[PDB]
Amino acid sequence: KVFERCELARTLKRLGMDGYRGISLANWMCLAKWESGYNTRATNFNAGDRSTDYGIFQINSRYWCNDGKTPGAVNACHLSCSALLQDNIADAVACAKRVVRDPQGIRAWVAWRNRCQNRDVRQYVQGCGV
Ligand SMILES: [Cl-]
Ligand SMILES: [Cl-]
Ligand code: NA
């Protein structure tokens, strides 16, 4: 499913992402935008280390979910990576919450540092009623 901006913003708020571990809703929106373009079925194979990024938040199979083909991988979210390809993003949000519970926080995603960190991210939630 390809979410529309405000539709996603309202959904994330209801799932309790606003201010989770100090991360504002607009930062989560900026992250989803640059990671998948708000697309839940997005997958990206990384030929370099044989891991794959799954879903709206492009969560990596080496640490967070299990796809069985990634070498030396763990499954911290204790989910099948298939769970992160659903239209319903409940499981993806629960795993994202797990990711930021680690010391790096939102910085775990390099794309966040490149396209969101230290920028005016207000535009991602403007007019959405959140
Ligand atoms: Cl699962
Ligand atoms: Cl599994
Ligand atoms: Na894994």
From Swiss-Prot:
Location in or out of the cell: Secreted
A GO MF label: identical protein binding
Catalytic machinery residues: E35, D53
Enzyme Commission code(s) on record: 3.2.1.17
Domain C-type lysozyme: 1-130
GO biological process: antimicrobial humoral response; defense response to bacterium; defense response to Gram-negative bacterium; defense response to Gram-positive bacterium; inflammatory response; killing of cells of another organism
Highest taxon of source: Eukaryota
GO cellular component: azurophil granule lumen; extracellular exosome; extracellular region; extracellular space; specific granule lumen; tertiary granule lumen
Any single Pfam family the record assigns to this protein: Lys
Keywords: Amyloid, Amyloidosis, Antimicrobial, Bacteriolytic enzyme, Disease variant, Disulfide bond, Glycosidase, Hydrolase, Secreted, Signal
Enzyme class: hydrolase
Disulfide bonds: C6-C128, C30-C116, C65-C81, C77-C95
Catalyzed reaction equations: Hydrolysis of (1->4)-beta-linkages between N-acetylmuramic acid and N-acetyl-D-glucosamine residues in a peptidoglycan and between N-acetyl-D-glucosamine residues in chitodextrins
Disease linkage: Amyloidosis, hereditary systemic 5: A form of hereditary systemic amyloidosis, a disorder characterized by amyloid deposition in multiple tissues resulting in a wide clinical spectrum. AMYLD5 primarily affects the viscera, and the predominant clinical features are renal dysfunction of varying severity, and intra-abdominal bleeding. Inheritance is autosomal dominant.
Protein family according to the UniProt entry: Belongs to the glycosyl hydrolase 22 family.
Its job: Lysozymes have primarily a bacteriolytic function; those in tissues and body fluids are associated with the monocyte-macrophage system and enhance the activity of immunoagents.
General remark: Lysozyme C is capable of both hydrolysis and transglycosylation; it also shows a slight esterase activity. It acts rapidly on both peptide-substituted and unsubstituted peptidoglycan, and slowly on chitin oligosaccharides.
Self-association and partners: Monomer.
Protein name per the record: Lysozyme C
